[PDB]
């Protein structure tokens, strides 16, 4: 039918040892370490990585006494970089620290002498939330599948089923969709790409078989895979050099992997290494929570929420709701529903979503959205 | 009318001295320096900045002999950081260099022994292009206005009309729109935010007046400003500490400022510091060129183009065209038009858009899209 308007859409994800993701995990491990001692820590920790080097850079004002060497090295250990053969080793890498206090000019307008409920936005910016009824967790299939493919390789690396696997990995999933009055419905997998760092002992043919049979067929529902699905498995033919040795990594360079995989929209701000006063994080989280709550209320099938802030001002400047033609109520009526049911000041968001809890390292690989353990993934019951 | 579905939409931009943008400009100045000597330079230059420090990090394989100290210091000079009073000085800062050759495992699959036309994609990834008929340059008004507000402050800083202005600035523009069968039409400016670093001699009241009268009223068409427009001008009340001293900066952390300001979509990849073999850049540029050419052909009013790649493979894995209900031809018919009129292999894109030319530092502030001098902004005449 013409109404089905068949289309392709692609998303990617990366694994725990991808150098950009190493940085996000380290930045969030530093955040967590601070929050365990000082729940009101002001943290803006950037991490940069390259061969043999982790650099911490940014601004922290906190009463915590944090051993940055240990936090960094424990994180790299967890990811799996523990020997020179792998290109990176937690035991023997350089950890360099260039951390200062938060600017007093920022402190004075954001939080100094303020009541927590009316804490100012930590910066200006725009943030989006997105939800789709296409999966139970209200996320695009493309991004969820991409994440799970990386998680599966990590699981098989750690169990020793595929002991040639190294931590740096990338995946990409192209799904063929149909549409239904603005809603989207996955039909089949059009193309899958997987690139993963590996040892020098395993053959290409063996790696390719394992990637199809033990990774892809374990993760992707069988109904979506068919004879015409295209597989680009270890397309480079060789990925021995990997991690920070293959590619310099930086915090906040996987913004789209972290969120919706190309769906919805993004305001530009990174999540990792930032406490709740940074609306780049807290408001993006709340926006996701709003979007998901609207879908789970049965008020729409798909929705994009935009919010924005000025530095030092608690109240959002603007909130906008876009439902892709999938709501019976108007977008203006839904904005009234959101105003009646949510308070998107960061000092209220912190309460609703428990954002001083040291769970941030868990968010920094495999996506900040879609996973059931995070508070912004528990829909709020709406009155309307 | 119900059809007009009035809504708010917000975009931001930043100035030349914003620390993230300093990094993009430096990464692209390094790229340009290489290309002037070696048109086929392989460059993946990340820059990090913080108080007193510029760190270059990443991978370069090139026959060029580049003086990184001079390239960095000239760039910081140009931006305007030339004295300790400003928080940063090109003469006296630290420049640290951690640059290695490109991974041979990447080299061997991307370009080694290949014919230029069939050069492989430098990585996997997804990229979007976007165009809208709402302005002549086919860009959202929100983002164009945000860019111009920063450019205006830079102009007045350099001319000495407003000599208290320093290089680090941020702007944010919320426009009230109506819609027309999927197209969008700006009606009025709802909210403007401007924060700009300044000296210790100027009063807040004087800065606020100058920002409204000499910056905003000079840039925003008078018809869009009215008595109810909200102005958040120097909302922090004090922005003396700025640049890398106020906030650590990193290359590729202004991805949304660089592109469409929240409109369209983003695939996640940074532009700055990368040669054309990196499809994060070349394919995003070509995607913009495709989108703009479709609007300028009169085939749609608004359009989003997605393309994607696997590392080492020249041909895009998938191309998708979304017209928001604004095309008479189907999205499938338009994809046929795009296939007949464009070749989105990076080794053809490089030819069409002249991507070995050292013009990249010019792209690294004020947006990569919308400005008439870049080849991807000259629409291609379509046969259909
Ligand atoms: C291809 S590298 C990006 C470009 C790189 N900076 C360069 O110098 O060309 C980006 C990501 O791809 C993955 N990668 C690194 N080496 C690879 C290889 N040999 N084959 C496939 N993927 C690789 C890693 O996850 C890495 O972080
Ligand atoms: C507010 S800082 C980001 C948060 C920061 N890392 C912190 O520690 O809280 C982000 C950007 O806002 C701008 N900025 C820095 N100081 C500011 C101030 N005092 N008032 C308004 N904007 C400022 C700069 O352009 C800076 O790069
Ligand atoms: Na896992
Ligand atoms: Na073999
Ligand atoms: Na200018
Ligand atoms: Na005064």
Describe the secondary-structure layout.
The structure is a homodimer of 384-residue chains.
Chain A (H helix, E strand, L loop, with lengths): L6 E8 L4 H19 L4 E9 L2 E9 L6 H12 L2 E2 L4 E2 L4 E7 L3 H7 L14 E8 L8 H19 L5 E16 L2 E16 L5 H16 L10 E4 L15 E2 L28 H18 L5 E8 L8 E5 L8 H11 L4 H7 L7 H4 L21
Helix pairs in contact in A: 1-2, 4-5
InterPro entries (chains A, B): ADOMET_SYNTHASE_CS, S-AdoMet_synt_C, S-AdoMet_synt_central, S-AdoMet_synt_N, S-AdoMet_synthetase, S-AdoMet_synthetase_sfam
Function (chains A, B): Catalyzes the formation of S-adenosylmethionine from methionine and ATP. The reaction comprises two steps that are both catalyzed by the same enzyme: formation of S-adenosylmethionine (AdoMet) and triphosphate, and subsequent hydrolysis of the triphosphate.
Subunit structure (chains A, B): Homotetramer (MAT-I); dimer of dimers. Homodimer (MAT-III).
Explain what this protein looks like in three dimensions.
The structure is a homodimer of 384-residue chains. In chain A, 29% of the residues lie in helices and 25% in strands. Chain A is an alpha+beta fold. Chain A contains 9 helices and 13 strands. In chain A, the strands form 4 sheets. A 4-stranded mixed β-sheet of chain A has the order 1-8-9-10, covered by helices on one side. In chain A, strands 6-3-2-11 form a 4-stranded mixed β-sheet, covered by helices on one side. Chain A has a 3-stranded antiparallel β-sheet with strand order 7-12-13. Chain A folds into 3 domains: 114 residues, GMP Synthetase, Chain A, domain 3; 141 residues, GMP Synthetase, Chain A, domain 3, CATH 3.30.300; 128 residues, GMP Synthetase, Chain A, domain 3 (2-Layer Sandwich). Chains A and B meet through β1, β2, β3, α3 and β7 of A and β1, β2, β3, α3 and β7 of B. Bound molecules: S-adenosylmethionine (2 copies) and sodium ion (4 copies). The site of one sodium ion has 3 residues of chain A, from α4.
């Amino acid at each position: 039918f013409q109404s089905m308007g068949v289309f392709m859409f692609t998303s990617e994800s990366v694994g725990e040892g991808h150098p950009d993701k190493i940085c996000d995990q380290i930045s969030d491990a530093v955040l967590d370490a601070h929050l365990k001692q000082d729940p009101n820590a002001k943290v803006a920790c950037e991490t940069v990585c390259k061969t043999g080097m982790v650099l911490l850079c940014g601004e922290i004002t906190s009463m915590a006494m944090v051993d940055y060497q240990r936090v960094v090295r424990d994180t790299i250990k967890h990811i799996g970089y523990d020997d020179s053969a792998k290109g990176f080793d937690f035991k023997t890498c350089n950890v360099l620290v260039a951390l200062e206090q938060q600017s007093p000019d920022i402190a004075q307008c954001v939080h100094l002498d303020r009541n927590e409920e009316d804490v100012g936005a930590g910066d200006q910016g725009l943030m989006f939330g997105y939800a789709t009824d296409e999966t139970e967790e209200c996320m695009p299939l493309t991004i969820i599948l991409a994440h799970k493919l990386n998680a599966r390789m990590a699981d098989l690396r750690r169990s020793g089923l595929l002991p040639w696997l190294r931590p740096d990995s990338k995946t990409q999933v192209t799904v063929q969709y149909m549409q239904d009055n603005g809603a989207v419905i996955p039909v089949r997998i059009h193309t899958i790409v997987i690139s993963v760092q590996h040892n020098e002992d395993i053959t290409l043919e063996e790696m390719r078989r394992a990637l199809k049979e033990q990774v892809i067929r374990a993760v992707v529902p069988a109904k979506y895979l068919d004879e015409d699905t295209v597989y680009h498995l270890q397309p480079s033919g060789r990925f021995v050099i990997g991690g920070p040795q293959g590619d310099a990594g930086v915090t906040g360079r996987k913004i789209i992997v972290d969120t919706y995989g190309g769906w919805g929209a993004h305001g530009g701000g990174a999540f990792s290494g930032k406490d709740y006063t940074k609306v780049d994080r807290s408001a993006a989280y709340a926006a996701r929570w709003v979007a998901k709550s609207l879908v789970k209320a049965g008020l729409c099938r798909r929705v994009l929420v935009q919010v924005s802030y000025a530095i030092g001002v608690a109240e959002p400047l603007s909130i906008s709701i876009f439902t892709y033609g999938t709501s019976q109520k108007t977008e203006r009526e839904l904005l009234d529903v959101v105003h009646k049911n949510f308070d998107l000041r960061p000092g209220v968001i912190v309460r609703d979503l428990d954002l001083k809890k040291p769970i941030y390292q868990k968010t920094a690989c495999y996506g900040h959205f879609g996973r059931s353990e995070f508070p912004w993934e528990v829909p709020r019951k709406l009155v309307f």
